[PDB]
Ligand binder design. Structure first.
Ligand code: HEM
Ligand code: HEM
Ligand SMILES: Cc1cc(N)nc(COCC[C@@H](CN)OCc2cc(C)cc(N)n2)c1
Ligand SMILES: Cc1cc(N)nc(COCC[C@@H](CN)OCc2cc(C)cc(N)n2)c1
Ligand SMILES: C[C@H](O)[C@H](O)[C@H]1CNc2nc(N)[nH]c(=O)c2N1
Ligand SMILES: C[C@H](O)[C@H](O)[C@H]1CNc2nc(N)[nH]c(=O)c2N1
Ligand SMILES: [Zn+2]
Lengths: 402, 404
């Protein structure tokens, strides 16, 4: 039975029929819903391959053409003989865009057709990965006029170990574990900071020390590469009216570039395929700076604003958070670096849901991730029912390589 | 290791397994192919087995499982079903089942309080006039001049052939919503339909933004009858802001008592179609949802203008600023009027404690994440970082179709 999807603000109703194209299972069953959880042979590869080839030629209107049939035989021949096959560059470009389009947790999908795709499948060493990573950052950063991009390194092969980027993002601040349990810097990065030191990085001692990359070619120890500081664009944070805010010395980097997820296209797996767009302000201002287990700066800001910390019912937390998000937006605007606030972002996601309804008969969307972390019911997406499911091409989680 | 849902808190880094979900009899809306968790809406021996399961729950809660009193009660229940098709609850079974239904409710953040519930047994009620009396008593007891007390009143269960006891209104206290000529609504847009039914049944409509609705009460096989709550039984809080002096001039108010009246209480397969329950409010229910939903009072823009914010650009965060002050005003006004209320921070902290109590007591706690996380400041509350397993346990509060 096809899910009846309701918007509770407008009273309007759609049916998701795209979900019937899901061949991959989620965490839920009839007995118990698990959607808020954050983490989880040839014939089988061959059917994923054909389905993806089908998707591709259909995308270009050439379904059933000579080109389509010869391509299917090519894939069939390659798999039967070698247990694997390879994508053409245009197929890869199509699959990368489709993976983003299909990503249930991403609120920036209105953008999905505008993705710069660097083919790095001819990469043979960590040194080469590094040069590719640098060009990606250079291109994507674009002096603050951010552009969405993905770089795709060589696929997994039954023989050997994977190409991997050990870092979870290409740009990450160090977290230094003190002996007295506390952390200087970003607590989310304690373990990666520690790995870098193991592999011979000289650590700094600041709150915003940019980490080096740990790049690993197949069956080789990962190698260390410091990013050239001029490649990493950063925004000093200040507030439009509160002068003391700048004194906090807060900053954030411009480029959100995820570097630990696997890209699956047609049953092929790309263990290193870092990707990037631009930030939504709440990622920085709410989660990264205010999570109790991150920089956790809410009390500092509240004390500065002279708020009554002694009681929850003064909404000191809520007031501080708002000012922090505002500073992020202000400082990024002042520095001419691309950013989108959570109101503009969710408004455009609504438009996206509507495009997808017309094009595909639905849109996989994970409500808990799409609704922003402050002012939820203030945005239109809170009021919109959403159906979550896995379509392929997909970005998947994979184990940490250590 | 364990073959039950693994549940993680991402703030604390701690793990638990939910083993309670193994007691779920009723299927929910999700399947392996697709998650419908964000959707707001989903006898014979069938009765017997639900009855048996409930009686077992009862005897466990008083630690007499396998006892002679337990096996006798089971027999008494099948005997009764055997000859009538239905059965009836002892008084303390009803009290236990009502508390358990609250405790089982996945959408309620107030559940730390579940043990403390006044159960008014009203299973002798035989007319609509008498429901009105019981309801008035409930409001008087629960309101307690502002020192609010959780309560439920239980009217006679559904019976074969015979028609239902129903309260037509969705809540005991609801403000009218009048459809205007210019297509807009005066009052609360959520209440247009029930407002128009009150008028069709001979209510003389007011024309304010905060006109308290009458009750449409229906006794078995009878047309609903209309009853006006005496104004002094309905405590309201006028809204003002601690520092923004003009806020009082907005003339906004809200009622003290949240009392849900259109849900069905199901216990051991028995169906209580009229069983209103009340607690106290969490501030975001009023200040964020009721006052700021675009499809509700929708006052955000009015407040932002008074605060002199830049409403022409999303990036000023004008909505965020206004919503915060509206919530502060709700809290402050309730505090001043000495009417019980809880902020979204205190509420979620207490829910975390509830979750920990339930882990030890029952091995899990069914929880609907989207509903438990408040509608402002989500990640600022600890529940945002808590994974949750949602599933249906019984006794349960259930939705039921509108009587009309
Ligand atoms: C263009 C601007 C973009 C914006 C504003 C944006 C926004 C976001 C946001 C806010 C999240 C939530 C994740 C979190 O809370 O940490 C997210 C997740 C995600 N986005 Fe985007 N996105 C953008 C571009 C992209 C691109 C280019 C890709 C891939 C090509 C992508 C794929 C994803 C994926 C896979 C996730 C889920 C990550 C996870 O589960 O850990 N997005 N996006
Ligand atoms: C003691 C104070 C209480 C507080 C602060 C509280 C809080 C809440 C909140 C915030 C919601 C969601 C409201 C919404 O979004 O509309 C809710 C839902 C609910 N609560 Fe409570 N609650 C309380 C007492 C009770 C009591 C006494 C019962 C029943 C005996 C109850 C049963 C429910 C149920 C069944 C729902 C779900 C309603 C639905 O699905 O539409 N709660 N609670
Ligand atoms: C492309 C893009 C743009 C944008 N504005 N934001 C993003 C999202 O940032 C990604 C953060 C992701 C990491 N894969 O989600 C957080 C996370 C994921 C996992 C698996 C574990 C963990 N602790 N935290 C991605
Ligand atoms: C007892 C109680 C205390 C408290 N603080 N808050 C409440 C919540 O009020 C419940 C409102 C419920 C109605 N069943 O949610 C609104 C709603 C639900 C549904 C299914 C549809 C709809 N249009 N509107 C209940
Ligand atoms: C447990 C819960 O699902 C978890 O905290 C999720 C909720 N929603 C989220 N939404 C976004 N965008 N990012 C997140 O990290 C999370 N965390
Ligand atoms: C689509 C979505 O389920 C809907 O807007 C829900 C979201 N979360 C909610 N949470 C609560 N507490 N109350 C609600 O009415 C809603 N509405
Ligand atoms: Zn689910």
């Amino acid at each position: 039975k096809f899910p009846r999807v309701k918007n509770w603000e407008l009273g309007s109703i759609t049916y998701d029929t795209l979900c019937a194209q899901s061949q991959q299972d989620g965490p839920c069953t009839p007995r118990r819903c698990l959607g808020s959880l954050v983490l989880p042979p040839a014939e089988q590869l061959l059917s994923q391959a054909r389905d993806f080839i089908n998707q591709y030629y259909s995308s270009i209107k050439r379904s059933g053409s000579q080109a389509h049939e010869e391509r299917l035989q090519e894939v069939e021949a390659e798999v039967a003989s070698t247990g694997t096959y390879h994508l053409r560059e245009s197929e890869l470009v199509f699959g990368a865009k489709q993976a983003w389009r299909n990503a249930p947790r991403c609120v920036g999908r209105i953008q999905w057709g505008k993705l710069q795709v660097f083919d790095a499948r001819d990469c043979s060493s960590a040194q080469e990965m590094f040069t590719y990573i640098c060009n990606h950052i250079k291109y994507a950063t674009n002096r603050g006029n951010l552009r969405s991009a993905i770089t795709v390194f060589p696929q997994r092969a039954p023989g050997r170990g994977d190409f991997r980027i050990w870092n979870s993002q290409l740009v990450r601040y160090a977290g230094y574990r003190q002996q007295d349990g506390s952390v200087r810097g970003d607590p989310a990065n304690v373990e990666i900071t520690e790995l870098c030191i193991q592999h011979g990085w000289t650590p700094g001692n600041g709150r915003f020390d940019v980490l080096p990359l740990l790049l690993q070619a197949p069956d080789e120890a990962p190698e260390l590469f410091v990013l050239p500081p001029e490649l990493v664009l950063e925004v000093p944070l200040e507030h439009p009216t509160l002068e003391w805010f700048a004194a906090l010395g807060l900053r954030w980097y411009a480029l959100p570039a995820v570097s630990n997820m696997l890209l699956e296209i047609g049953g092929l797996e790309f263990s290193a395929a870092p990707f990037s767009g631009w930030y939504m302000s709440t990622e920085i201002g709410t989660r990264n700076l205010c999570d109790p287990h991150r920089y956790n700066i809410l009390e500092d800001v509240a004390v500065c604003m002279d708020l009554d910390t002694r009681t929850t019912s003064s909404l000191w937390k809520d007031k501080a958070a708002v000012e922090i998000n505002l500073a992020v937006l202000h400082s990024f605007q002042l520095a001419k670096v691309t950013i989108v606030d959570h109101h503009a972002a969710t408004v455009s996601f609504m438009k996206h849901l509507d495009n997808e309804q017309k094009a595909r008969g639905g849109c996989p969307a994970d409500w808990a991730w799409i609704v922003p972390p402050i002012s939820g019911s203030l945005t239109p997406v809170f009021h919109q029912e959403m159906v979550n499911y896995i379509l392929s091409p997909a970005f998947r989680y994979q184990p940490d390589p250590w």
